[PDB]
Short mmCIF file of all heavy atoms in Angstrom, two decimals:
data_model
loop_
_atom_site.label_atom_id
_atom_site.label_comp_id
_atom_site.label_asym_id
_atom_site.label_seq_id
_atom_site.Cartn_x
_atom_site.Cartn_y
_atom_site.Cartn_z
N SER A 6 6.87 68.61 -24.55
CA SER A 6 6.08 67.76 -23.66
C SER A 6 4.61 68.18 -23.68
O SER A 6 4.27 69.34 -23.89
CB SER A 6 6.65 67.74 -22.24
OG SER A 6 6.66 69.01 -21.63
N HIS A 7 3.71 67.23 -23.43
CA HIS A 7 2.26 67.48 -23.33
C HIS A 7 1.96 68.52 -22.23
O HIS A 7 1.10 69.39 -22.38
CB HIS A 7 1.49 66.16 -23.13
CG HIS A 7 2.31 64.91 -22.85
ND1 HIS A 7 2.38 64.27 -21.60
CD2 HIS A 7 3.13 64.26 -23.72
CE1 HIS A 7 3.23 63.24 -21.76
NE2 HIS A 7 3.70 63.23 -23.01
N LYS A 8 2.77 68.49 -21.16
CA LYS A 8 2.83 69.49 -20.08
C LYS A 8 3.19 70.89 -20.57
O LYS A 8 2.41 71.82 -20.36
CB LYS A 8 3.82 69.01 -19.02
CG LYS A 8 3.84 69.90 -17.78
CD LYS A 8 2.53 69.81 -16.99
CE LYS A 8 2.68 70.47 -15.62
NZ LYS A 8 1.56 70.12 -14.72
N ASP A 9 4.33 71.05 -21.23
CA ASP A 9 4.76 72.31 -21.85
C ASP A 9 3.78 72.79 -22.95
O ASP A 9 3.76 73.99 -23.26
CB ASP A 9 6.17 72.11 -22.44
CG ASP A 9 7.33 72.23 -21.44
OD1 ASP A 9 7.12 72.60 -20.25
OD2 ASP A 9 8.49 72.00 -21.85
N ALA A 10 2.94 71.90 -23.49
CA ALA A 10 1.85 72.21 -24.41
C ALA A 10 0.47 72.46 -23.76
O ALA A 10 -0.49 72.75 -24.47
CB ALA A 10 1.80 71.11 -25.47
N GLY A 11 0.36 72.39 -22.43
CA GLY A 11 -0.84 72.81 -21.69
C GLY A 11 -2.01 71.83 -21.72
O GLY A 11 -3.17 72.26 -21.76
N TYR A 12 -1.72 70.53 -21.75
CA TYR A 12 -2.72 69.48 -21.93
C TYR A 12 -3.63 69.13 -20.74
O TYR A 12 -3.38 69.50 -19.59
CB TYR A 12 -2.07 68.22 -22.53
CG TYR A 12 -1.55 67.21 -21.53
CD1 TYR A 12 -1.92 65.86 -21.67
CD2 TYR A 12 -0.68 67.59 -20.49
CE1 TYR A 12 -1.40 64.89 -20.79
CE2 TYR A 12 -0.14 66.62 -19.62
CZ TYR A 12 -0.49 65.27 -19.78
OH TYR A 12 0.06 64.32 -18.98
N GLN A 13 -4.70 68.40 -21.06
CA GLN A 13 -5.66 67.77 -20.14
C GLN A 13 -5.93 66.31 -20.53
O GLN A 13 -5.56 65.84 -21.60
CB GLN A 13 -6.95 68.62 -20.04
CG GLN A 13 -7.43 69.25 -21.36
CD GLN A 13 -8.72 70.02 -21.21
OE1 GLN A 13 -8.85 70.98 -20.46
NE2 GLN A 13 -9.72 69.64 -21.96
N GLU A 14 -6.59 65.56 -19.65
CA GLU A 14 -6.93 64.14 -19.84
C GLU A 14 -8.25 63.88 -20.59
O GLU A 14 -8.64 62.72 -20.78
CB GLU A 14 -6.95 63.46 -18.47
CG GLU A 14 -7.97 64.08 -17.50
CD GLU A 14 -7.95 63.31 -16.19
OE1 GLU A 14 -6.98 63.47 -15.40
OE2 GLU A 14 -8.88 62.50 -15.95
N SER A 15 -8.93 64.94 -21.00
CA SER A 15 -10.18 64.91 -21.78
C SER A 15 -10.25 66.00 -22.85
O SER A 15 -9.49 66.97 -22.80
CB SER A 15 -11.41 64.99 -20.85
OG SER A 15 -11.29 65.97 -19.84
N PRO A 16 -11.18 65.89 -23.82
CA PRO A 16 -11.44 66.95 -24.79
C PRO A 16 -11.89 68.27 -24.16
O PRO A 16 -12.35 68.33 -23.02
CB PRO A 16 -12.54 66.42 -25.71
CG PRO A 16 -12.54 64.91 -25.51
CD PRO A 16 -12.00 64.72 -24.09
N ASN A 17 -11.80 69.34 -24.94
CA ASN A 17 -12.29 70.69 -24.65
C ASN A 17 -13.38 71.04 -25.68
O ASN A 17 -13.10 71.58 -26.75
CB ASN A 17 -11.05 71.61 -24.66
CG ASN A 17 -11.34 73.09 -24.82
OD1 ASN A 17 -12.42 73.60 -24.55
ND2 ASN A 17 -10.37 73.85 -25.25
N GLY A 18 -14.64 70.69 -25.37
CA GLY A 18 -15.80 70.98 -26.22
C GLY A 18 -15.72 70.31 -27.59
O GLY A 18 -15.90 69.10 -27.71
N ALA A 19 -15.42 71.09 -28.64
CA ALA A 19 -15.19 70.57 -29.99
C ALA A 19 -13.79 69.98 -30.22
O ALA A 19 -13.58 69.27 -31.21
CB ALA A 19 -15.48 71.70 -30.98
N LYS A 20 -12.80 70.28 -29.36
CA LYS A 20 -11.37 70.03 -29.62
C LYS A 20 -10.80 68.91 -28.76
O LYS A 20 -10.87 68.97 -27.53
CB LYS A 20 -10.57 71.34 -29.45
CG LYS A 20 -11.09 72.54 -30.26
CD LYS A 20 -11.92 73.52 -29.42
CE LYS A 20 -12.60 74.64 -30.22
NZ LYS A 20 -11.65 75.56 -30.87
N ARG A 21 -10.21 67.89 -29.38
CA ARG A 21 -9.41 66.82 -28.74
C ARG A 21 -8.11 66.59 -29.51
O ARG A 21 -7.89 67.26 -30.52
CB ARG A 21 -10.29 65.57 -28.52
CG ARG A 21 -10.14 64.37 -29.47
CD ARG A 21 -11.19 63.32 -29.10
NE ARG A 21 -10.92 62.04 -29.76
CZ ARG A 21 -11.81 61.30 -30.41
NH1 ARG A 21 -13.08 61.59 -30.47
NH2 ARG A 21 -11.46 60.22 -31.03
N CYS A 22 -7.30 65.63 -29.08
CA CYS A 22 -6.37 64.93 -29.96
C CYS A 22 -7.13 64.15 -31.06
O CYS A 22 -7.92 64.75 -31.79
CB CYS A 22 -5.37 64.14 -29.09
SG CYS A 22 -4.62 65.24 -27.88
N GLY A 23 -6.99 62.83 -31.18
CA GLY A 23 -7.82 61.95 -32.04
C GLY A 23 -7.63 62.11 -33.55
O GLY A 23 -7.18 61.17 -34.23
N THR A 24 -7.91 63.30 -34.07
CA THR A 24 -7.43 63.84 -35.35
C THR A 24 -6.88 65.27 -35.15
O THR A 24 -5.86 65.62 -35.77
CB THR A 24 -8.54 63.82 -36.43
OG1 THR A 24 -9.11 62.53 -36.57
CG2 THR A 24 -7.98 64.17 -37.81
N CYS A 25 -7.46 66.07 -34.24
CA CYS A 25 -7.08 67.45 -33.94
C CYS A 25 -7.00 68.29 -35.23
O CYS A 25 -7.71 68.06 -36.21
CB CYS A 25 -5.81 67.45 -33.05
SG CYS A 25 -5.02 69.03 -32.61
N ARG A 26 -6.10 69.26 -35.24
CA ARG A 26 -5.43 69.80 -36.43
C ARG A 26 -4.00 69.25 -36.55
O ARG A 26 -3.30 69.60 -37.51
CB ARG A 26 -5.54 71.33 -36.38
CG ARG A 26 -6.99 71.85 -36.49
CD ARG A 26 -7.62 71.52 -37.85
NE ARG A 26 -9.07 71.78 -37.88
CZ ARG A 26 -10.03 71.05 -37.36
NH1 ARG A 26 -9.81 69.95 -36.69
NH2 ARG A 26 -11.27 71.42 -37.50
N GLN A 27 -3.56 68.41 -35.59
CA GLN A 27 -2.16 68.03 -35.36
C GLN A 27 -1.92 66.56 -34.92
O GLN A 27 -0.77 66.19 -34.71
CB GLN A 27 -1.59 68.97 -34.28
CG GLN A 27 -1.44 70.44 -34.71
CD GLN A 27 -0.22 70.69 -35.59
OE1 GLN A 27 -0.29 70.71 -36.81
NE2 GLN A 27 0.93 70.88 -34.98
N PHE A 28 -2.93 65.69 -34.76
CA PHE A 28 -2.69 64.35 -34.20
C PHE A 28 -2.01 63.39 -35.20
O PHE A 28 -2.21 63.50 -36.42
CB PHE A 28 -3.99 63.74 -33.64
CG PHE A 28 -3.78 62.52 -32.75
CD1 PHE A 28 -3.14 62.63 -31.51
CD2 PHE A 28 -4.26 61.26 -33.16
CE1 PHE A 28 -3.01 61.51 -30.66
CE2 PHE A 28 -4.13 60.13 -32.32
CZ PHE A 28 -3.50 60.26 -31.07
N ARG A 29 -1.23 62.43 -34.69
CA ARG A 29 -0.42 61.47 -35.47
C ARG A 29 -0.64 60.04 -34.92
O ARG A 29 0.16 59.57 -34.11
CB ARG A 29 1.04 61.98 -35.43
CG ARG A 29 2.07 61.17 -36.22
CD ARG A 29 1.94 61.39 -37.73
NE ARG A 29 2.99 60.66 -38.48
CZ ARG A 29 3.05 59.36 -38.73
NH1 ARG A 29 2.08 58.54 -38.49
NH2 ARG A 29 4.11 58.82 -39.25
N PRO A 30 -1.74 59.36 -35.30
CA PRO A 30 -2.10 58.04 -34.77
C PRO A 30 -0.99 56.97 -34.80
O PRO A 30 -0.11 56.99 -35.67
CB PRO A 30 -3.29 57.58 -35.62
CG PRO A 30 -3.99 58.88 -35.99
CD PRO A 30 -2.83 59.87 -36.12
N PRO A 31 -1.02 55.98 -33.88
CA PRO A 31 -2.05 55.77 -32.85
C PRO A 31 -1.81 56.55 -31.54
O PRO A 31 -2.70 56.57 -30.69
CB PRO A 31 -2.02 54.26 -32.61
CG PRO A 31 -0.54 53.91 -32.77
CD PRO A 31 -0.13 54.82 -33.93
N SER A 32 -0.64 57.16 -31.35
CA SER A 32 -0.23 57.72 -30.04
C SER A 32 0.80 58.86 -30.10
O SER A 32 1.46 59.14 -29.11
CB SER A 32 0.30 56.59 -29.15
OG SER A 32 1.48 56.04 -29.72
N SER A 33 1.00 59.50 -31.26
CA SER A 33 1.95 60.61 -31.45
C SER A 33 1.22 61.92 -31.80
O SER A 33 0.03 61.91 -32.13
CB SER A 33 2.99 60.27 -32.53
OG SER A 33 3.71 59.09 -32.22
N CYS A 34 1.92 63.05 -31.78
CA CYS A 34 1.39 64.35 -32.18
C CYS A 34 2.42 65.20 -32.95
O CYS A 34 3.63 65.06 -32.77
CB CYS A 34 0.85 65.03 -30.92
SG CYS A 34 0.33 66.71 -31.23
N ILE A 35 1.92 66.08 -33.82
CA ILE A 35 2.71 67.04 -34.60
C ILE A 35 3.07 68.26 -33.72
O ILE A 35 4.07 68.93 -33.98
CB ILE A 35 1.96 67.40 -35.91
CG1 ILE A 35 1.78 66.13 -36.78
CG2 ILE A 35 2.67 68.48 -36.75
CD1 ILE A 35 0.88 66.30 -38.01
N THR A 36 2.34 68.52 -32.64
CA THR A 36 2.71 69.50 -31.60
C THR A 36 3.53 68.85 -30.48
O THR A 36 4.53 69.42 -30.03
CB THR A 36 1.46 70.16 -30.99
OG1 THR A 36 0.54 70.54 -31.98
CG2 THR A 36 1.78 71.42 -30.20
#
């Protein structure tokens, strides 16, 4: 879960979802 992964509703400086090192468009993730 995004919860068990420690998420927020906005980016952290240089780091977001979007492409990340792990994002899977349009709405999935590899983490």
Side-chain angles (χ1 to χ4, degrees):
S6 61
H7 10 107
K8 186 68 168 194
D9 279 353
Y12 91 130
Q13 38 178 60
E14 60 178 74
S15 44
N17 162 22
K20 307 101 187 296
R21 102 185 193 227
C22 307
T24 307
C25 175
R26 296 295 169 284
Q27 292 282 96
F28 194 67
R29 183 74 177 76
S32 64
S33 303
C34 173
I35 298 172
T36 315

